[model samples]
Target chain A: AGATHFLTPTGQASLVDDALYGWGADMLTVYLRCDPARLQALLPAGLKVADGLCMAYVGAFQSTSEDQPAAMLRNPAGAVYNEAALSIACTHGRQGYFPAFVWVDKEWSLIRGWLNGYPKKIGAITLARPHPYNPVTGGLREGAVVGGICARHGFTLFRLGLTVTRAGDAGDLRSRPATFGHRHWPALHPTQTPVSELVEVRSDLRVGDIWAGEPFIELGSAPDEALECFADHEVLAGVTYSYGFRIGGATRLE
Target chain B: ATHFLTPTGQASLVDDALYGWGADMLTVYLRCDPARLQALLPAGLKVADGLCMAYVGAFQSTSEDQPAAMLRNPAGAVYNEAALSIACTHGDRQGYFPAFVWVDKEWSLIRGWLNGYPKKIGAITLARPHPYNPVTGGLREGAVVGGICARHGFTLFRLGLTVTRAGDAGDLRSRPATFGHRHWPALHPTQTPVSELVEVNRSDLRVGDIWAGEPFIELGSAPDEALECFADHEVLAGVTYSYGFRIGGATRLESL
Candidate 1:
């Protein structure tokens, strides 16, 4: 109820969401629940699946090498865009060789497909809460600690997947309330990097709660809505949980 | 006699043994006799007994380490020895260390006799009795030439031979006293060290007297009339001693 907002730089929220779901072709909020046995079966086996690489004519723009790879993705409108360009530039930054890598959504899907084929490969897949802070301009100083909690929960979370839901023109550009002329959207200042003010004085900021995993509580059957399918059993009483944030470096999301 | 009244720092009074009494501790003297102490000891509690180490450090160049000397007396003599000379300087210079001695006959006797011995130390006199009448006050501001006295049976003995028989009084400058008392129980020049003689000139200072040999007797038996022998018996001598010097610093003894 108090200050239900993330104090992040402008344009960062939209950039993060767009990078994760738009040109990167990733689906948002795909939740998965698995028992302990399923969690154990999804680990990667130690072998390369394909051999005997096929040769084709070398093209002007496409070059595949150990350090650089040719990859592409199509937007919903069927626009062919270099996946490496969109994924690497929006995610890893155009650093190291060339700007190209598969989006996390596509990568996770590929891995899930491999696991489904080999049922004993892995068990659980967890989608961690995204970086609580604005990742583009380095989100809330305190928001970064959620990544640590995510890691502590034994899930490989990505920084780009997290989106600040605070939707207001309150000087933040990524927010929805800002319009053209009277645009109060705060421009993403390139120089600003969010840092924890509490840490400066060596104090606990009490930012957020550290959750090991998505916590679930049971509620007895009292709802008037009828369940249409068996899958509805998976949906019990929904509880909205809110927590705070801690500040630090963003690279910890690996 | 020109009272060679120079304040020697505290003097060391060592002791040996005498006869069956074994070794004894040394003592210092304030006034000559015990009965004369009424005027000086005003409700005075005896702080220390027998002899105490004289606090006056000797003159630096005077052949003693740290320029400190001791007060010693020999048997059969009337005064302290040569009043072993350590050096004394004017101000608190880096090279000069200050020292003092308490004047009590009982303390001097115990320390001078039981402990090894002290050079003939000096002190500013508080009060001395008139030679004719023990009741009357003697010339006040004279220097007391002190030597260590050891205890023998009921009487305290002396160590080195006493050299000078008399010394000048500071205030009077004319009157002099025999180094100690003239009686058998009194100080003898024969037991005082011939080498060490010092003068203490300040008159305002005061101290105490008592039995001090409890520690040494606790150690071992002292020699009897030997080269450094002294008597270790207890005696009811008066405040023939005054307490002044406080023990200072740590000193380690080098065996000869």
Candidate 2:
């Protein structure tokens, strides 16, 4: 037996463990008001669109291994990466979020997300972070604006602009219980049936100081993209927040 | 401790349906211990005639336009692939399911993941006759072709064949029903585990000249890859062919 039963080429070294502890992280989000009918069709069978609401984010993240904490110190670069994700608000008996699509800057991030049903792909992701010491890149304060972008194949999928208007607020991810995602894998030859299932991601979370801001978003459509289907007909508030969360479990749904 | 071609880095991800053409593929048919394969396949999939297919091929792909213009590895799209797929059935359905695959390139690995390919990165070599290097001969009577797929330094498998005669495209069965199940493990018992029976509705295909032959294969063992579980009880007929295929997406197959 190998050290981990994950991903492929099973071995002692996996991209990340089953339980990922991101002790510190920064995330920029733009919630969208979508047409429920268009978004509903995007979900796996049996899941329903809850409020025509979709969440998109670009985050710079670092995760510590519950199995090996020292690896972070040995190779700091391996522990950090950026990600951009688009999730639809869904209900499967209880409230959940389905990452209709996710893009990450590192292969490790993409593989780790898939184990818990993240539906992750790879892309070039960028986020504007402020440097407290550098005047040009000011600290997190009122009137300071930052931008987050997600893209691939020289095409933009979506991007966000946030102008912090309030420095402090207790932010809430209302009705959010878990990330409900489907694991769908197609078979190679015609004699077999592809495997599919809906699973709830198991993880604990803690939110931190949130800066509220005016939100602005731009969306694009590629020949293969369905981002246009969930139009940003209604744009919500932009928020920048820091938090630490650990992900290391799962649950299948009917 | 191990590493695949991409365990340490990022490969450009293309979620778009892929179109591959001018592929040189050779399949070595196999007959394994029906009992062992049954134990290896997911619960719902039934062993079919104790048969399976191992293949090695060179692939060329793109998204129709050139996404290559935007990528650091524009040629990432072209790769070599080797696979060991089981022949199985579910209720009245019959098809092939890949136990796993070893590809030479990361692009191929990611594409396989989206479709439940169980693909890993490895070194794959295809041995064939070269026209300019005729000491190797050509694809004619008694001409030879062979391949070796090694991953993480261990040879996963070896395949070889010699042209026997003109062959029917029907020499090998058409696996209209392919199984690529998403078998995700749970970190906590309360979280349980997840399983999905997925089948892709594939469309558009092209195939080229196929030659019949007597095939040779040897399954290698490695703790990390676990290829020896296949236990090649017996090796059977084989055919070398040229083909083109597509990858769109998969659908959930209702469980029994």
Candidate 3:
């Protein structure tokens, strides 16, 4: 067998593996007070809506599969893409988050999400990027602008436009809860029983320099996705940051 | 820009195909429901007499022209595939529409997506024979070969073949048409829909000795798949052979 896991072609130089390690992912997130019913619809039993707040964000990711730790920067076929997701803040007595919807531009990332219980779709996602020393769109500073949009199959799922307002600490991000979900493999026919299991995102989830921002959120929906149900007034708050994390197999939840 | 970041570069994140060398093919064919099979096809394709085939095999690809790429990075080079393809017609042209393909690796899955083969992650197993082991005799009379595949724990289907007669390279009929559908949904604002019929660039086609045999196909019942709805009514043909084909580029038949 090759140095790969999770799927076949047990070749030594495969692109992905059982776990994923992501680095320098640029993200813009906004928290909204959404419809409790809409957020509740995505929740499985034993979990309930906590604050009705949904964390919506669009991100550009640089990720690597297991075994080739340096492949993210070296390999020609490394995993890189833009994505957007809606993770609803929830409660299982303890505060937890459930990702209601996710959209990715790359099929590899989309498939990776499915294996880990993320109901991800293929979509076109774009976000404003910044460089500390670049000539155009200079580095992060007070009043600097950040924006992104996620679209798929002729429809816009959501749009984000924000401006940096202040330097922030981990406390600006610590308010978030542990993410939870259900990994389900539906039956191909009616006679077959689907395999469903409660799963949680397993990660150390370390963040880099953080910044606070006020956001203007515009949400859209597709023929298959119902993101409009999540639209509500006033983005309670949002943030911008870069982060590094290790995504392992889902942790079975009680 | 990264491999998946630039075009064809503007606003896309997929790369081109790689050259490869591989063999050991286990293919089985059956006659299923024409109407049911037609329902699964896109607008332009019409089913070919309810004929379909399930294939289980191994493939190793390379991005480098250097021969060492295959051995240096076996992870990127090798993968197992189990797919069910339907015989269909694109106007006057004959083709195979692979409605579902299960591959064990991510790189191969990405390669298929880049070319319009609907692939998912699954377990593929093919029992090959060997001359050195008496228990697993070479391909001759009474020799048996089979492949079993499943995804999400639900068995997709099973294919078994028992060799009965010697065959030449041309005796292999389980091979499908070279064309397939390239259907990509458009985002409208920045992307265009790629819903064209296309033929693979198999100019490097080559085949080894073939063995004629009797085939057995057992359709499966999975909620996410409908292969059972087009259950095999009879076995049309079967074969065990080793063949290698190069996958480089494709010619898309535009104008729908």
lDDT of 1: 0.19
Tens-digit lDDT track of model 3 for B147-205:
87766435677778899887776665533355656777787868977677666756577
- Backbone clash count for every predicted candidate, in the order shown: 153, 28, 23
**Can you give the lDDT of residue B58 in candidate 2?**
81
TM-score per candidate:
0.14, 0.49, 0.48
Q: Candidate 3: where are CA atoms >4 Å away?
A: A1-9, A12-16, A20-22, A73-77, A191-193, B1-256
Q: What local lDDT does model 3 show for residue A168?
A: 80
TM-score of 3: 0.48
The ten-residue window of minimal lDDT in model 1 chain B covers B68-77
DockQ metric for all predictions: 0.00, 0.01, 0.02
lDDT of 3 by residue, A1-254 (tens): 23234345656543346555555598888878877877788788767887687788889888876556666465544568888998877876667788878888887677667767788888778888577787776778777788887765435567787788888877666355567777888999999998787777746677877888777887754457887778665578778888877777777776
Assess the local accuracy of residue A249 in candidate 2 as a C-alpha lDDT between 0 and 100.
51
Point out the higher-scoring one by DockQ: 1 or 2.
2
All candidates: CA RMSD (Å): 41.4, 23.5, 14.8
Q: Candidate 2 residues B1-256, lDDT tens each?
A: 1133365334336545445445888889888888888876777888898898999888877665554643655466578889988899878788888887888777667666666678888778777776476575567777788887865335577788898876767777777778877655689888866577777645767676778888988776655777776775687788887787765666667542
Please provide, for model 1 over A1-254, each residue's C-alpha lDDT reduced to its tens digit, 9 standing for 90 to 100.
11112325443212111111111111111121223232222212221111111100000011111111111110111111111111100112111111011122122222321222211112122222222211122212222111111111233212112222332221321111110010012236867653211000001111112122121211112132111111122311111112111211112111
